[PDB]
A = this chain, B = another copy of it.
């Protein structure tokens, strides 16, 4: 039968550290997606509709990773689009039907399978409203009909969306859309709404909580002030939020996931039959250095690579080197690892 939301989350924990509430939202939505797909479609049966998601989170928190990790066990077509590549219909650039074109290409152009697929639209915040806004509000307007039920006309994987063009009819009624983006200036809007206060001897001054706390209480009013049109927010009823990664999340990302960076280099060192070991202080230092540079989980790979460069240059020649040890000094200082024979 279908995988329960708990089982879906269990396979998201092997790849994503933290963000439990968004994992709940994604799992429940995918479970309801399956149930809707196998719900009888005729007779006295009630007609079900979909509940799309708006996945809000800071840069490098795990939105694109949540989608990729969810796609491994979807059993339905899945794609990852980027709203920044879209434009208004009559202007140079990609149209919103190219998303369905990609979704249709992932499933051997079987329309019956694409009409039941899932779509992730990244950088949904970069098309915000704030003359003709071909790259912003125009894309939001073009997505309104596509997100909800419509019959799109897509090109056959070959060209643009032209009048002199052969087309395929795809019904996006049962296609689940997952929008995501790093609404940077959203914390300011939420703070303006929740901490209005006022000026004057007779005015009431309101008390004056970072990106995580404010995102956890986001409302459509803030998303409208940010630049999203209400017609789009109404089509994204579910709003899931990601917590920004801290130092402890970074060290867990280094060690805990199935294909974690430490496991990456451990397996890479198992090729030449040597053991790679990281001290706890070494991982804590890598996390501090990735945080101080304000990179996030993006920069952990650069740190480990720059620390193991000179040792990897000498791996296939150093015979008898049973173990390699990375200490706190190797991370913080310009030192070389310990090479135990």
Residues of A within 8 A of B (CB): 4-6, 24-25, 27-29, 31-32, 35-36, 38-39, 45-49, 51, 59-60, 80, 82, 84-85, 89-94, 102, 105, 122-123, 137-138, 141-142, 145, 153, 157-160, 164, 166-167, 182, 184, 219-221, 224, 229-231, 233-234, 237-239, 258-259, 263-264, 266-268, 271, 293-295, 298-299, 301-302, 305-306, 309, 312-317
Residue among A28, A123, A167, A230 with max Cβ neighbours from chain B (10 Å): A230
B84 pairs with A219, CB closer than 8 A: no
A85 pairs with B93, CB closer than 8 A: yes
B48 pairs with A220, CB closer than 8 A: no
User: How many monomers of this protein are in the complex?
Assistant: 4
Pick the residue among B25, B92, B230 that contacts A309 (CB under 8 A): B25
B138 pairs with A84, CB closer than 8 A: yes
Q: Using Cβ atoms and an 8 Å threshold, which residues of chain B touch A49?
A: 259, 264
A305 pairs with B238, CB closer than 8 A: yes
Closest residue to A142 on the B side, CB-wise?
B85
Q: Shortest CB–CB separation between residue A292 and chain B, in angstroms?
A: 10
B138 pairs with A32, CB closer than 8 A: no
A46 pairs with B258, CB closer than 8 A: yes
B160 pairs with A166, CB closer than 8 A: yes
Closest residue to A35 on the B side, CB-wise?
B271
Query: A91-B94, A271-B35, A293-B221 are contacts. A264–B28 as well, Cβ < 8 Å?
Result: no
A301 pairs with B51, CB closer than 8 A: yes
B84 pairs with A317, CB closer than 8 A: no
